[PDB]
Amino acid sequence: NLMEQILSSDNLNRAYLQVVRNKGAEGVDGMKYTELKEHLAKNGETIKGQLRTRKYKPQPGVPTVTDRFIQQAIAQVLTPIYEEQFHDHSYGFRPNRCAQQAILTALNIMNDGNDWIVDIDLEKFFDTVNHDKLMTLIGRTIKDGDVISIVRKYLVSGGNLSPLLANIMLNELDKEMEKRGLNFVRYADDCIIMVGSEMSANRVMRNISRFIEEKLGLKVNMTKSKVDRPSGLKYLGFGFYFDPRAHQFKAKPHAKSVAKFKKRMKELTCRSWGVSNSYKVEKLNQLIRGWINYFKIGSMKTLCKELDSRIRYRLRMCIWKQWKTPQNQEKNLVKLGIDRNTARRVAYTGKRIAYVCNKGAVNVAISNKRLASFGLISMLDYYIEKC
RNA sequence: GUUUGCGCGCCAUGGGCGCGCUCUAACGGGUGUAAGUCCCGAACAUGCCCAGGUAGUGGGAAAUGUAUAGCCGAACAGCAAGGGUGUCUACUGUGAGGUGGAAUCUGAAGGAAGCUGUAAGCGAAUCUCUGGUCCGACGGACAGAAAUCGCAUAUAAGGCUAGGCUUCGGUGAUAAGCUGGCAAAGAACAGUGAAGUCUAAUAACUGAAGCAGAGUAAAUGCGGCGGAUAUAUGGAGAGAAAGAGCGUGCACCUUAAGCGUGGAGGUCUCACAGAGGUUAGCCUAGUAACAACGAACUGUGAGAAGUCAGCCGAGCCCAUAGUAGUGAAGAAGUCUCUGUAAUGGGGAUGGAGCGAAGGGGCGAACAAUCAUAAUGUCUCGUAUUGCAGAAAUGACAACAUCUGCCGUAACCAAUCGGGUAAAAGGUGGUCAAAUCAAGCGAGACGGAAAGGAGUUGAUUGAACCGCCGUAUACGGAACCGUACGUACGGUGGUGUGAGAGGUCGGAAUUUCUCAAUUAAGAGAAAUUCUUCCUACUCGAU
Ligand SMILES: [Mg+2]
Ligand SMILES: [Mg+2]
Ligand SMILES: [Mg+2]
Ligand SMILES: [Mg+2]
Ligand SMILES: [Mg+2]
Ligand SMILES: [Mg+2]
Ligand SMILES: [Mg+2]
Ligand SMILES: [Mg+2]
Ligand SMILES: [Mg+2]
Ligand SMILES: [Mg+2]
Ligand SMILES: [Mg+2]
Ligand SMILES: [Mg+2]
Ligand SMILES: [Mg+2]
Ligand SMILES: [N+]
């Protein structure tokens, strides 16, 4: 009787609105989402009748758009009550639960202080999930067989049902962990399992690997699942370092994240690019606001300030490259506020001279007040304003 | 749309080939028939070293200058004919315009074959060895192409820039080159420096190799192989060898800003003749051109400024023009040798031709895009088959599970020797199934319709980045350039920059009309896009 809760007008138009805010790729059908609106406006009774009578035949590298609308409706009807069923320490794919408070909870329980962290990974998770056991757990939760029927025929056949199915299969494991009394966090697929003793770390490793391999039907790789120290194993782009005050085990962005940050930065502000530097300033601003809104809790202030110095040196180097003509280089430099002959010698020197750019009168030619007049915000200020 | 950039002609102050004299190693001597060629000698000044934080004397090792006849002139200065101004001004014309000046800018990398004077540099047949460099196209180095070989090469080789760290911390001089954190190349300065050769002398006083990174790219790097090498490339050895200036000759050969001349096509001005409307009187423009508003259009005649940028483009068309030119020192054409990738070059006949400039058109071709007898399957039966739920009873109290301990160590933290399934230990019986069983299915079996594995039309190809070869020049030998330097022949890449004016064409949309003024339908003025045009204004080469 729950497909009779599915096929209700507010649920359908909310699912439709969510799919058109997704703006997903069309793919094999190649069918555009406003025409998805038109096609559902002409096929609503047909699709709803097929849902009632279970003769729907959905078909997939990119899913079909009407199938995406059906996914969104199924997820919208299935997340409530399940959220009460799901473990409260599982922070994936729900409203009001993200990875940042997952790392915050992890910080709380390493303030409790479990030593060796078991990074449990499950390679090819959708391959290891059995359809029958997942449907069995769904049938144990919801008794009406029509939704079980459509989810089953869909599973034999981004996606908005894969979060719920992953959360179901992981949440049974989370309930078993709470049955053990063990402490652990997981976002979506990656599990950090926290234990204070290396012998107990290997014991919990063996227990969990055997429990995953037989009862759940899933498989855990022996590559990622090493019982290692927190400084050597990362969780969602975050590394953990030791505050040398004994009470905290503090967080930082893992160096691969900052490597990606630096790489995208340097590939965005190449001074051989032909685009105006206001556009590059705005793109830089987009990346920094996203990067703070993700990595707020983990500290890299001693690293991000060196990166700030790199930011302003790179901007001054880019502006010097974009001026590109020695005569107007001299003219713009003397407009900047330096004397004529120093501008002359610097302008004839201006070919190459990366060394004069990183330190010299070139670095004084564009300063912090001038780049604040340009309008780009610093990383440190976006820290001190952020909660 | 980047000062110049077109055709034809003349002229070397350019080069070559013959001739003539004369000069040549500081100054001097030898040597030998013969020295410009081979040998020998002095002084001063500089570099380098004795300073040992210094620096004036005082001395020494290589090297260099004074010091070949002579060359060539800096990214050096001064001059400078010319060229520009969208800057002022005097004159001249009815007018398009012309001319002369003041204020400047330029006077360049391709002919005032610009002038004068410098710094630095150079500076002698040929042979041999060697270092360095450059080249053997372009194309991230494929394809294509006449156009080396093998690897490597972008989340980035390899070259650099500044630090951390492992190990060692008097000999020099010379001097092509290499690098100074990257498009490429050059100058200057700085720091190093290959092959060798020469030298390894004298008494003092007042930092280099290797390992990991962090940076740093408009891409090449490394190793052969062939070749080139007069910025007279760095040197080493043979070599009684040739170099330099000046004059001069040729039926010798060339030059983009010099000199003379030629300008189509298209734009503008003016006076005549025909239309036009203004009220026999006026005007015939303004808008960059196109379109449009418009009376504002057209054949004449008189002029004026004026060209000249490969990009798909053979050839035909217009006009200067079959003219300027060129051609009897000898044209077109024919015949016979010959080269290249292609363009080309001789020779013999032959006895009059041959034959320009810029701008628009049309346009073949080339290129791109677009047109041109199984499986299988839907529907019932038929019993299996995939996972869950309490478990009479049977077997076993042995399996799941959370908690990191030993000592030793002067106090363990292998922080010292064990052990990571080290110990002490909590919690929960653990299961094979009599038994039955929602829901979703998934397969498997028959009966049930059939079916089965070359060519041409059209549209676009705006503009650019180059590269190679012969010829011809310059900055700066190579390299990098000078519009790809330019001409001709070869050859790959990128693909439609802004603003403004149009075309407001086509569609959506604001407003109207139509389909009944009803569709998310169609159309008309115009908003956006799109299509197309425009150097008109900017930007790019
Ligand atoms: Mg070449
Ligand atoms: Mg080359
Ligand atoms: Mg190349
Ligand atoms: Mg490397
Ligand atoms: Mg020499
Ligand atoms: Mg004239
Ligand atoms: Mg073209
Ligand atoms: Mg063309
Ligand atoms: Mg030169
Ligand atoms: Mg070259
Ligand atoms: Mg070149
Ligand atoms: Mg070039
Ligand atoms: Mg160019
Ligand atoms: N030009």
Author numbering: 5 to 64, 81 to 177, 195 to 424
From the paper:
pmcGroup II introns are self-splicing retroelements that have played a key role in shaping eukaryotic genomes as the ancestors of spliceosomal introns and non-LTR retroelements. Group II introns encode a specialized reverse transcriptase (maturase or intron-encoded protein (IEP)), that binds its parent intron and facilitates self-splicing, releasing a well-folded lariat ribonucleoprotein (RNP) complex. The liberated RNP functions as a retrotransposon, targeting DNA that contains spliced exon junction sequences and inserting via a two-step transesterification reaction known as reverse splicing. Unlike their larger IIA and IIB counterparts, group IIC introns are almost completely dependent on their IEPs to facilitate intron excision through lariat formation, thereby forming the functional RNP that serves as the minimal element for retrotransposition.
We were surprised to observe that the apo-RNP has an architecture that is almost identical to that of the complex bound to DNA, and that substrate binding induces only minor changes in the structure. Most remarkably, the RNP active site remains completely intact. The maturase does not change its orientation in the absence of DNA, remaining coordinated at two anchor points along the D4a arm, with the thumb and DBD inserted into the active site to participate in catalysis. In this configuration, the binding interface for the target DNA is maintained, enabling the RNP to readily recognize an incoming DNA target and rapidly engage in retrotransposition. In previous ligand-free intron structures, EBS nucleotides were found to be disordered or rearranged. Here, we observe that the positions of the EBS nucleotides are unchanged, likely due to the presence of the maturase. These findings reinforce the mechanistic role of the protein as a stabilizing catalytic component. Further evidence of a pre-formed catalytic core includes the persistence of the heteronuclear metal ion cluster, which remains organized around the lariat, although M2 is not visible in this case. The apo-retroelement is completely poised to react and does not require any reorganization of structure upon target DNA binding. The arrangement of the active site, from substrate recognition nucleotides to the heteronuclear metal ion cluster to the DNA binding interface, is preserved despite the absence of DNA substrate.
